[PDB]
Amino acid sequence: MDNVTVRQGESATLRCTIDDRVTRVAWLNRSTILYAGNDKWSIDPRVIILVNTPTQYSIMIQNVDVYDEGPYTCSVQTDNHPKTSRVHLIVQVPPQIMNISSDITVNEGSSVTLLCLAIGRPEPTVTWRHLSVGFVSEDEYLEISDIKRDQSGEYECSALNDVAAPDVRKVKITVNYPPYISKAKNTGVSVGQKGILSCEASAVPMAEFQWFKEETRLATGLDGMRIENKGRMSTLTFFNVSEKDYGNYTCVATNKLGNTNASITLYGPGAALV
Amino acid sequence: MDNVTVRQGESATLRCTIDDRVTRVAWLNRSTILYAGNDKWSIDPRVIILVNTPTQYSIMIQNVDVYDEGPYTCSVQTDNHPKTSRVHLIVQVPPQIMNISSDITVNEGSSVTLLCLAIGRPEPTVTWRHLSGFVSEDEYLEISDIKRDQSGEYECSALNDVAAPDVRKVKITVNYPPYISKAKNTGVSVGQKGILSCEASAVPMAEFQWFKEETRLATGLDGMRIENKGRMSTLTFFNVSEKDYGNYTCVATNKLGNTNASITLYGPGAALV
Ligand SMILES: *[C@@H]1O[C@H](CO)[C@@H](O[C@@H]2O[C@H](CO)[C@@H](O[C@@H]3O[C@H](CO)[C@@H](O)[C@H](O)[C@@H]3O)[C@H](O)[C@H]2NC(C)=O)[C@H](O)[C@H]1NC(C)=O
Ligand SMILES: *[C@@H]1O[C@H](CO)[C@@H](O[C@@H]2O[C@H](CO)[C@@H](O[C@@H]3O[C@H](CO)[C@@H](O)[C@H](O)[C@@H]3O)[C@H](O)[C@H]2NC(C)=O)[C@H](O)[C@H]1NC(C)=O
Ligand SMILES: *[C@@H]1O[C@H](CO)[C@@H](O)[C@H](O)[C@H]1NC(C)=O
Ligand SMILES: *[C@@H]1O[C@H](CO)[C@@H](O)[C@H](O)[C@H]1NC(C)=O
Ligand SMILES: *[C@@H]1O[C@H](CO)[C@@H](O)[C@H](O)[C@H]1NC(C)=O
Ligand SMILES: *[C@@H]1O[C@H](CO)[C@@H](O)[C@H](O)[C@H]1NC(C)=O
């Protein structure tokens, strides 16, 4: 056969089967004579002789280097004609991601280009995979146009050349999008009890909240109520409810590229049918 | 240079200059070892060693063949790294015409194709030349509507600028219907041998016939002898009479046409202009 394939750092064995009565025999690395009979031309201690019988002439390149890849010939001399047999030593290298795109934040609707360049022997192929809801691309470049919020998360570059494990590495796209209210219940409370309104927005970056009644803002320091903010969530607390506290309150979530609000009612208890 | 160019059948000399402290040396024919130090690997008596000094390792392939053309490498081993140096043996062969078109006869107006195929190293170029004029410079010379003046010998010359160019010729003969090319009148005193004669120009040669008043004259008849060379024909009178003076017609004929002329056997007398 034509190909002798060896993984880098292991030993390559170059065996020459000899069917004809041979007078002289040699192993060549390109046009340099490595071994001629028992006479070692090379000074490389990696190149050693293994078999020297009239049926076989075999050497070994231990700890193979990329620089070893190339044509090695078993050249001989018979009593009739010279004969040769050429083999190609192919060195294989596990794949490795060199440069990878670094994490990004981008606003919704814009474009994103991720780039994954890798090396290996033979030249590796590469696949991108979105790690949420997914083979998105199979090229060094992954290009996304009009990025939606659900396209955020981790994209995984996987480079393989069918030598050892493929090399994987990941990059995180975080998409900014304006807020929307995702929780807003009404609450009923009897006069004189503790009443809790609360909203929850979904936004990147997180939304800040503000509480209004009839389009006038409520501050925390005011008596009888307190505004508390968590991640995404915000609560307006009444400690002693009165008949005036009843009504509609608007929770306004804002972030650097938009705002939204919802309105919820602090109402009094009572029976209801349908 | 990298190229050693040798004429086929001469000797090629492969000299390897060695500007280094070399421990081992060899001449390779492609991936075949020819000579390693003083150890001749080749069994070809043409390959002989010429120089084996610390500064030079040189062999010779005497009586070089085309099959020798290729890369020959002077491979060595130094104290530090192996080194090589390729030279390219280029074999040159004088040009030679292999097959050539054979002589033809063809009728006027038809087509003729002459073909001249030749070989050589490097591959030769070819020119045709009409010997009666470089008509073409290709293996194929194509002539359409061949005229009578295009007959004769066409010469193929193949050259590659090594040794002499090879030449060989082919003969086109064009058939055409006759035309009269000589027809003088002749005057003769009564009682003396008088010779009329015509000459036609035709391929193949024209045969002649002699007429008087659109009636043929035969050779066996007494007093007249008709004699035909190639182009020429002669009507001979041995005893002239007043009945014989007058106009005679020369009819030249060949396989693809005829023509005639008239000439007068005339009697003496005064004439003005
Ligand atoms: C088979 O033949 C090839 C071609 O000559 C040999 O490749 C050569 O290998 C050496 C190292 O093995 C390379 O030289 C130097 O390596 C050192 C690293 O220590 C570096 O510092 C130098 O910059 C340089 O690279 C050399 O470049 C390379 N030459 C070529 C044309 O590839 C190979 O060694 C031979 N292998 C066997 C088993 O005989
Ligand atoms: C250098 O190496 C080449 C091949 O690597 C040698 O070429 C071989 O040369 C011989 C004759 O010199 C050829 O054998 C002849 O074959 C013809 C028919 O093709 C036959 O008529 C003859 O009787 C003869 O056996 C051989 O085919 C040819 N092989 C190739 C692949 O070209 C060359 O001789 C070497 N030159 C040297 C050692 O000076
Ligand atoms: C809430 O949203 C509406 C638009 O739908 C707007 O008219 C209103 O002013 C907003 N309320 C507050 C307090 O921003
Ligand atoms: C008052 O709250 C209720 C419940 O969401 C809503 O239907 C109504 O439109 C709100 N009106 C205003 C001005 O917020
Ligand atoms: C000679 O030529 C003319 C026409 O070219 C023709 O009339 C005549 O018959 C021809 N033959 C002879 C024998 O004159
Ligand atoms: C006969 O001879 C005369 C004298 O040249 C010439 O003018 C005339 O054309 C000829 N007629 C024929 C039929 O040959």
Numbering used by the authors:
A (entry chain B): 42 to 174, 179 to 319
B (entry chain A): 42 to 173, 179 to 319
Could you share sentences copied from the article?
We previously reported that OPCML interacts with a subset of RTKs and induces their degradation and/or dephosphorylation when re-expressed in ovarian cancer cells.
To localize the clinical mutations on the three-dimensional structure of OPCML and to gain insights into their role in the tumor suppressor mechanism(s) we crystallized soluble recombinant OPCML (residues 36–316) and determined its structure using a combined single-wavelength X-ray anomalous dispersion/molecular replacement approach. Structure solution was complicated initially by a high degree of translational pseudosymmetry, but identification of the correct space group and non-crystallographic symmetry elements allowed for chain tracing, which was followed by rounds of automated and manual model building and refinement. The OPCML homodimer resembles an inverted V shape, with dimerization mediated by a membrane-distal D1-D1 interface stabilized by a combination of hydrophobic contacts, hydrogen bonds and salt bridges. This interface comprises 874 Å2 of buried surface area and has a solvation free energy gain (ΔiG) on formation calculated by PISA to be −9.5 kcal M−1. Below this lies a network of mainly hydrophobic contacts mediated by the stacking of Trp 82, Ile 74, Leu 69, Thr 114 and Arg 127. Overall, the D1-D1 dimerization interface is highly conserved since five of the seven key residues at the interface are absolutely conserved across the IgLON family (i.e. Leu 69, Ile 74, Asp 80, Trp 82, and Thr 114), with conservative substitutions at the other positions (Arg 65 is Lys in LSAMP and NEGR1 and Arg 127 is Gln in LSAMP, IGLON5, and NEGR1). Asn 70 and the first NAG residue are completely buried by D1 and lie close to, but do not make specific contacts with, the reciprocal D1.
